[PDB]
């Protein structure tokens, strides 16, 4: 009656549907009552400020619990031996067995071992005492306070920006490319050369000797005179020990391009030089778009001048399409962020840049799986907001004959081709897996279809991995690429070739016939998830089953049992199905990564290389073999430290099967069941006294599709996090 | 649950409050709020 104050149509139904739909609709600011575009944008802006403060309070809490309850002082003595403590366990339910089991990593209290890798990150960026982390945590509390005050300030009518301020794409691109992506990268290169590189070489550069101690014995006058070679004078020698001065070198910017031979990570000077180059390129890229002064570009001119014969209108009227639509902007942002979160995951495991994080295996597994799951979620959200844009903000009159109109003008062709490629690739990946499985089971493993993944092996050979016998570009030192004949500027190449050809690191893993089939399974998952997502994006405006879906919106339940039956026709239901396929694909690739690295870390790579080509190899050497240490986390004899992970394993199974309840059984059964329960309550003595204000109804169709999806997701993630974190910590620390 | 770290009484008081007082108070206020008028 009062709760969903943003929508009067929800403050009228006397059911529990208004509670559920108030919680769900609360952030869809476009559908609130009394909403103009200006109030939309200002409310969005202050919501962003609140969320920035959420992020800063979260990292403040991580810092404060590493500082207060963690063994950061002890861990930076020998990071290889001591496990990093995340925070302290305090619940009154623990028996004596659990308290003695969870006392670990040199503590008195029960503690949680940190698998987020924040210890390695804080140790690499130069933080070496609990007081430094406490100062960082209080500083981030103050920064979060500042952003909360900024959000409250920009809700004040004097400081509320106009619509022309929010619709200013060129100035925002200038200040984000230059001032946010370039100045922050420059400032990080400054922290690296002033604090992280010197304290990696031994000396303390705090806030007190910050100005008194130059990073280089040469001042900034060599930087101004152009003689920049002194900053790369003597690099860190290959016998350098992190945190102390043995063969330091005193070169703040070098480009060795290999790995540190002791921390197994990249050199901090190489990181600083990288961020300096990135800052220079991003700063000059932020001077591209027109602003109050005369020079620059206007994006409308750039877009509208790209008209070809094979598209016709080209990109005409795409500036107003992107600028006026917030779901287009959110789809582009989520697509790029999902791509670069995949990129973060794929590069932080093969090119680690933190001290001793390539030798702590559980945190590397947790970080990879975490960022690949975030990347899958963000990519699915990009396509979800593509569908929401096509429903809500898409104008087929202004977007006449441009690239968007021609996306929708042939959607059947590309949906049918995604159908063909996903069917083709799925038929033959399952065919090869079932063939290998059947002929291995029939006692004849020599009959397997084992395909050498020659293309990726050739890619590795082009990057310098000389194991496979190709001598093409960098594996052939006589070639034009390896010598770089005009200048011989390959300063990175000796270090890179020394790092790619060592069998220890995860940089360019050896790829065999078991990797071919899982890459094609991953391609199948990507293609089928993309098929469902674009089949919801392009059919959001209507198919022949329902030529008007733009008027029912994004997430209507169905269209009745007529027209044959119309159960999951909304674009939201294509989100739903592609959410399942995303979870499957990320399960496939994280299963593959996990088993490949359990082979690599243990040294017994033969297990993956012969047993990953058929499905019971995946089932008995990975799922069954590696859960042995998991389910024995608590047995009738006792309890060890992998007991909360066994409990989370079972917990995730339970959440998953409850998701099955919501996805399989549908609303009619539950509505008549609740009708019987309502009769029971209204007709019993002593409980007639208590009456509902909101009449109990079953969850809606789309609501319980969402709830089953949430259960499937949460149980799926909790089960796999428990398994992946207890299987590595079962056998690696 | 002994506490070796500094201010071990602080989790002793903050686990009941975040476990009970924050949920009981928050659900009580939200129950008054969503059902008001």
């Amino acid at each position: 009656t009062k709760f969903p104050k943003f929508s009067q149509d929800l403050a009228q139904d006397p059911t529990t549907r208004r509670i559920w739909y108030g919680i769900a609709t609360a952030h869809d600011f476009e559908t609130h009552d009394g909403m103009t575009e200006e109030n939309l944008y200002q409310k969005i802006f202050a919501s962003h400020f609140g969320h920035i403060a959420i992020i800063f309070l979260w990292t403040s809490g991580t810092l404060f619990h590493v500082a207060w309850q963690g063994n950061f002082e002890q861990w930076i003595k020998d990071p290889l031996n001591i496990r990093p403590i995340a925070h302290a366990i305090w619940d009154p339910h623990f028996g004596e067995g659990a308290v003695n089991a969870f006392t670990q990593a040199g503590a008195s209290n029960p503690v949680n071992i940190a698998y987020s890798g924040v210890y390695h990150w804080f140790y690499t960026i130069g933080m070496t005492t609990n007081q430094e982390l406490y100062s960082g945590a209080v500083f981030l509390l103050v920064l979060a306070s500042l952003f909360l005050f900024a959000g409250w300030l920009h809700l004040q009518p004097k400081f509320r920006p106009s619509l022309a301020w929010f619709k200013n794409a060129e100035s925002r691109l200038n200040h984000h490319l230059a001032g946010l992506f370039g100045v922050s990268s420059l400032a990080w290169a400054g922290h690296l050369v002033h604090v992280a590189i010197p304290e990696a070489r031994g000396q303390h550069v705090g806030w007190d000797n910050f100005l008194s101690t130059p990073p280089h014995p040469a001042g900034l006058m060599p930087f101004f005179t152009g003689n920049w070679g002194v900053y790369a004078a003597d690099p860190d020698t290959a016998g350098h020990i992190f945190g102390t001065s043995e063969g330091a070198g005193t070169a703040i910017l070098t480009f060795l391009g290999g790995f540190h031979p002791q921390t197994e990570s990249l050199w901090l000077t190489d990181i600083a030089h990288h961020h300096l180059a990135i800052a220079v390129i991003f700063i000059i890229a932020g001077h591209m778009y027109r602003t109050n002064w005369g020079i620059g570009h206007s994006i409308k001119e750039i877009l509208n001048a790209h008209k070809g014969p094979l598209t016709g209108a080209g990109h005409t009227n795409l500036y107003d399409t992107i600028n006026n639509s917030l779901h287009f902007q959110l789809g582009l942002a989520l697509a790029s962020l999902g791509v670069i979160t995949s990129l973060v995951a794929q590069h932080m495991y093969s090119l680690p840049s933190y001290a001793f994080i390539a030798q702590d295996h559980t945190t590397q597994a947790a970080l990879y799986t975490h960022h690949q799951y975030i990347a899958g979620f963000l990519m699915v959200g990009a396509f979800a907001h593509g569908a929401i844009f096509f429903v809500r903000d898409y104008d087929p009159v202004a977007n006449k004959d441009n690239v968007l109109a021609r996306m929708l003008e042939h959607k059947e062709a590309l949906i049918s081709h995604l159908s063909w490629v996903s069917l083709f690739l799925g038929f033959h990946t399952l065919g090869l897996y079932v063939h290998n499985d059947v002929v291995v089971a029939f006692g004849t493993p020599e009959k397997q279809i084992l395909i050498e993944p020659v293309f990726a092996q050739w890619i590795q050979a082009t990057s310098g991995k000389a194991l496979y016998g190709f001598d093409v570009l960098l594996s052939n030192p006589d070639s034009i690429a390896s010598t770089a004949w005009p200048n011989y500027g390959n300063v990175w190449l000796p270090g890179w070739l020394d790092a790619i050809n060592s069998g220890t690191n995860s940089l360019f893993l050896t790829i065999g016939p078991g990797d071919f089939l899982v890459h094609h399974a991953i391609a199948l998952g990507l293609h089928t998830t993309a098929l469902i997502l674009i089949k919801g994006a392009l059919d959001a405006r209507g198919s022949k089953l329902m030529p008007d879906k733009k008027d029912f919106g994004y997430s209507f339940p169905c269209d009745g049992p007529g027209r044959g039956g119309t159960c999951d026709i909304s674009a939201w239901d294509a989100f739903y199905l592609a959410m399942f396929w995303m979870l499957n694909t990320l399960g496939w690739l994280t299963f593959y990564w996990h088993w490949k690295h359990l082979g690599v870390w243990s040294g017994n790579v033969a297990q993956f290389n012969e047993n990953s080509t058929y499905l019971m190899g995946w089932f008995r050497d990975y799922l069954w073999a590696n859960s042995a240490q998991l389910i024995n986390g608590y047995n009738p004899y006792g309890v060890n430290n992998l007991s909360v992970w066994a409990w989370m394993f079972l917990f995730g199974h339970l959440v998953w099967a409850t998701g099955f309840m919501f996805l399989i059984s549908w609303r009619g059964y539950w509505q008549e069941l609740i009708e019987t329960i309502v009769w029971a309550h209204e007709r019993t003595p002593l409980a007639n006294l208590v009456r509902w204000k909101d009449k109990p109804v079953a969850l809606s169709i789309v609501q319980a599709r969402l709830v089953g999806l949430a259960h499937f997701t949460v149980g799926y993630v909790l089960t796999y996090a428990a398994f992946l974190i207890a299987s590595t910590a079962g056998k690696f620390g | 649950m002994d506490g070796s770290y500094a201010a071990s009484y602080l989790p002793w008081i903050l686990i009941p409050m975040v476990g009970w007082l924050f949920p009981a108070v928050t659900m009580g206020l939200l129950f008054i709020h969503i059902e008001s008028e």
Binding site: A46, N130, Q131, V138 | -
Partner: peptide, 30 residues
């Protein structure tokens, strides 16, 4: 290690994001 009063100092400092978050959320509710 870390001090007893640094934790309480962090708590009374974080009382300021509490107040500002309460006032920002209240102002968003309008």
């Amino acid at each position: 290690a870390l001090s007893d009063t640094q934790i309480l100092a962090a708590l009374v400092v974080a009382l300021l994001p509490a107040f500002l978050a309460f006032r920002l959320s209240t102002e968003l509710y309008k």
